[PDB]
């Protein structure tokens, strides 16, 4: 009887090859190919969005963490940054935040049939074990990930408008000009789904644990005058701290070859500050005072372009 | 007139919104087969028997006849005394007392183990249509107030 | 500058449940230098024990004459150094970043583990810590602030830390985490001057003063001496009790007014102002 | 010879005249009147106006007015939880009509929030406006498969003629639904290639969607869950304007040949077609809008989401499908277990699920008649009026090599089986 049980598929056909053609055009719209292998040795970096850099024309990612992992992959594997004008290259995907159970996103999607997903926490621990033998560079790396990161997140959640936030942290379509009834309901996503994307951003680097009070005042309908002045004091001390980090970092840019992991983290905060089109007091400060930091972050990038 | 000093699944079943006896709290199954649940069996001039148990995601005996209980697994003994319309009762596990108040339109109860376990189950029926349920779980030593409230209206 | 530093202690000292307050009383005591009093002159240490004066719920607050509240030890110390040698020195212009980086590393990596020992370790929280909030707050709120701080530390320590085999697994990965973190701090501190006391040394030594001052503190003193020897633990502990046994002449202390006490009337008003 | 109402203050006397003049009036004195009372007897109980529906009196009993079910739950870990629901029948005074507002709310602080709202207004004896404002969260493939959340409203309208040309139940149902839908992958990286293909990472995100509907059902079966004769036909349309167009058709036919329905022979046919109306194949159709096959409530002898094309291991639906199924039931011949709803059940299912490349209806029916994924098996069923237990033992006759086979025992529970 058990012998008869093993043979009961009396025919098994070939797998199935018909594909949704509209899906495979959307993945082609969001993929950015890392230039310069088999089918399984290729990873895919999932980022938040992609901005076109004005100078080198490369397709950089819009978060200071997504751009740091992208430059650290270009250095470890000897790649070139993708071109904003898109044979089994690697890739860079524009994903949503919701392609994880963690809802935070740079991720890494390695391989095809044995496909392993490295989350944000697993990536940020991989990139932290590369500097762990130097005890001093671990100090500055913890500083840029805590003091400068908390300043940048608060300027982009609170000080910038929702048209500025969803430009940087969403894969939805940009507004442009509302001429179509499609564009009315595309504009209605960035008004409806703005606060829900802002909330998932504040769960990435334990920002919800260092700043429990200004994240609790986010998830609400009406914020009163008392929460608006407590938040104004927290943001203002996060910014005065962050001027001191940026002013002290100007002495630490002496490079002698390929850039270390701290120089790829300084250069990834400056490149996503100076992409913000609004005067959010970080772009005002970096464009005016830290002119030597803007020039350093362009010099760091142009060993990853072609 | 049976209850097991029923604090379990009667006052911790009231702290969530959820979704020969044969007792079963069978949640659901799979498309292959699973239980997710409970199965209880049992077995004269006294009230006795022998039970089983199986859970997923225990064999003992019975002796009952004021009413005293009994249970000897791989062991529980309890009692329930009748006093007026206000009641009493003690139990032990190998150790808490019972405070049943079955008086009409205000049927509540509480218990207290010789530990930091204080569980009061207030249940007020102040109108013939509506009902209130206060579920106190004041654990003083483990410092948690696991209280719950409730209401039920109908016109 | 003119303000009122609000802390967590009672009577004459900071409480052991907050290593940012013990490091801040030591900071203000150790300002004896000419230019290091200039940033402490008129600070008015108040032991208010109520968190509802803070901008973020933590209680080293510097409420400074305007509502300009700076909270936490690292933000206060960086504020006072902006408004500018034995016993507390001011770092050089060339070393303000490394000394800020060592403050931040103790605040996020080492103060996480003292937060674990003060509310997670079941021997310390039961015998010592849960009985310590009875004498800092008032009668109705003896019961929520220890459980809230215990809940905040569990989310902060679940990522590297977590029935006899269950608990001794936790004390092995804690001890691997503390030994890794103190070695990172000691190798990075040894880039500045060594014979001098900085603001980042007072926050590290206030973590040892709490972790070796708990009922489970005897294991850690044996475990730290297995890595760093006795010749450093007997050098650190001799700098700690030097700070505990210092005169309080530099503190310009105060009593909390009837706006800062955390009474039942003055915490239902501050609860009502949050909505 | 005359009709008398008794009670009937929970509504309006003039709008009840619309119900009475339809079926009870213009009824030839004893021609249709015994059934014409029985038509209104079943109509006002489904309009929620009569809880417990010569001389012909109208025994109408009002349902309720409030059913509030509030209640909180603290846990002192900041684990507060609250919930509220009430099936309030708003009084006929001050709107005009029989209306039935509902307000399920559930706020949890470590669970997602629910906001079901409904308002069933009764326009005519044969019309129901149902406005449904919702905010819900459910799991799509499995508990650790995919996390879908839906905010938005839904206007709707039923229409069931109580008098026909030819009890054949017939109704049309239009709707109009605006919905902001968030799709989240909640599968872990430990279960590594499941829900982590290139077309499941791409479906995650938010979208806003307006849809227009239609549904025509013509049910002539003598029972809706335990039938023994007669057919069915259900035709569903959807239109998200400028995005897609969806059409399902479902047939059914039940027939019996023995004395007390001892041998019951069923036959189901389903088919579908989904078009992409979206400006040269941009704007892909969402994965929760495409057709899925397999499982117990579908082609049996496969797992749920067990047929169709796949990317790595994820069933990614199809733009067109066909399905069928036979069934014989035998009514338990063990000399007295009979007259009960427990049949010995032999089935034969099958079907095909296909992405049709959006060119023509010529190539699509060429794809659907080529390599079906059939199965068979013998099992025992239970056919309650409100449920259907099924325990089969299935065998897959033919399949594809990457189907989720599940060749063994299978437990099926639901209402609709094919």
From Swiss-Prot, chain A:
Membrane keyword on record: yes
Among its keywords, does the record have Transport?
yes
| GO cellular component, as recorded | mitochondrial outer membrane; mitochondrion; SAM complex
Pfam families, per the entry: SAM35
| A Gene Ontology biological process term | protein insertion into mitochondrial outer membrane
Keywords associated with the record: Membrane, Mitochondrion, Mitochondrion outer membrane, Protein transport, Transport
Q: Which InterPro entries match?
A: SAM35
Where in or outside the cell is it found? Mitochondrion outer membrane
In its miscellaneous comment, the UniProt entry states: Present with 1470 molecules/cell in log phase SD medium.
Subunit structure and binding partners: Component of the mitochondrial outer membrane sorting assembly machinery (SAM or TOB) complex, which at least consists of SAM35, SAM37 and SAM50.
* Name of the protein this chain belongs to: Sorting assembly machinery 35 kDa subunit
State the organism named in the record: Saccharomyces cerevisiae (strain ATCC 204508 / S288c)
Q: Which gene encodes it?
A: SAM35
Swiss-Prot record, chain B:
Signal peptide region? none
Spell out the subcellular localization from the entry.
Answer: Mitochondrion outer membrane
Q: Which domain of life is it from?
A: Eukaryota
The record's similarity note reads:
Belongs to the Tom40 family.
Quaternary state and partners of this protein? Forms part of the preprotein translocase complex of the outer mitochondrial membrane (TOM complex) which consists of at least 7 different proteins (TOM5, TOM6, TOM7, TOM20, TOM22, TOM40 and TOM70). Interacts with mitochondrial targeting sequences. Interacts with FCJ1.
Q: What does this protein do?
A: Channel-forming protein essential for import of protein precursors into mitochondria.
Q: Would you tell me the protein name for this molecule? A: Mitochondrial import receptor subunit TOM40
Q: Which organism is it from?
A: Saccharomyces cerevisiae (strain ATCC 204508 / S288c)
Task: Supply the source organism's classification.
Answer: Eukaryota, Fungi, Dikarya, Ascomycota, Saccharomycotina
The gene name on file is: TOM40
Curated annotation (Swiss-Prot), chain C:
Membrane topology category: Multi-pass membrane protein
Concerning InterPro entries, the annotation shows: Mito_Protein_Transport_Metaxin, Sam37/metaxin_N, Tom37_C
Cellular component aspect of the GO annotation? cytoplasm; mitochondrial outer membrane; mitochondrion; SAM complex
Keyword Mitochondrion in the entry? The reply is: yes
Single GO BP term: protein insertion into mitochondrial outer membrane
Is the keyword Transmembrane helix in the record? yes
Q: Which CDD domains match?
A: GST_N_Metaxin1_like (cd03078)
Keywords in alphabetical order = Membrane, Mitochondrion, Mitochondrion outer membrane, Protein transport, Transmembrane, Transmembrane helix, Transport
Give the stretches traversing the membrane: 16-32, 196-214
Lineage, top-rank taxon, reads Eukaryota
Its subunit composition reads: Component of the mitochondrial outer membrane sorting assembly machinery (SAM or TOB) complex, which at least consists of SAM35, SAM37 and SAM50. SAM37 interacts with TOM70.
Physiological role: Component of the mitochondrial outer membrane sorting assembly machinery (SAM or TOB) complex, which is required for the sorting of proteins with complicated topology, such as beta-barrel proteins, to the mitochondrial outer membrane after import by the TOM complex.
More details: Present with 1580 molecules/cell in log phase SD medium.
* Protein name per the record: Sorting assembly machinery 37 kDa subunit
What broad taxonomic lineage does this protein's source fall under? Eukaryota, Fungi, Dikarya, Ascomycota, Saccharomycotina
UniProtKB/Swiss-Prot annotation, chain D:
Cell inner membrane among the record's keywords?
no
Keywords recorded for this protein, A-Z: Membrane, Mitochondrion, Mitochondrion outer membrane, Protein transport, Transmembrane, Transmembrane beta strand, Transport
TM annotation in the entry: none
GO molecular-function terms, A-Z: membrane insertase activity; protein transmembrane transporter activity
Can you supply a Gene Ontology BP term from the record? protein-containing complex assembly
CC terms in the record's Gene Ontology section: mitochondrial outer membrane; mitochondrion; SAM complex
Instruction: Enumerate the Pfam families for this protein.
Output: Omp85
How is it placed in the membrane, per its record? Multi-pass membrane protein
Q: List, alphabetically, the Gene3D superfamilies matched.
A: membrane protein fhac: a member of the omp85/tpsb transporter family
The source's domain of life comes to: Eukaryota
UniProt subcellular location: Mitochondrion outer membrane
Its subunit composition reads: Component of the mitochondrial outer membrane sorting assembly machinery (SAM or TOB) complex, which at least consists of SAM35, SAM37 and SAM50. Associates with the mitochondrial contact site and cristae organizing system (MICOS) complex (also known as MINOS or MitOS complex).
Protein family per UniProt: Belongs to the SAM50/omp85 family.
Q: What does this protein do?
A: Component of the mitochondrial outer membrane sorting assembly machinery (SAM or TOB) complex, which is required for the sorting of proteins with complicated topology, such as beta-barrel proteins, to the mitochondrial outer membrane after import by the TOM complex.
Notes on the domains: Its C-terminal part seems to contain many membrane-spanning sided beta-sheets, that have the potential to adopt a transmembrane beta-barrel type structure.
Question: What is this protein called in UniProt?
Answer: Sorting assembly machinery 50 kDa subunit
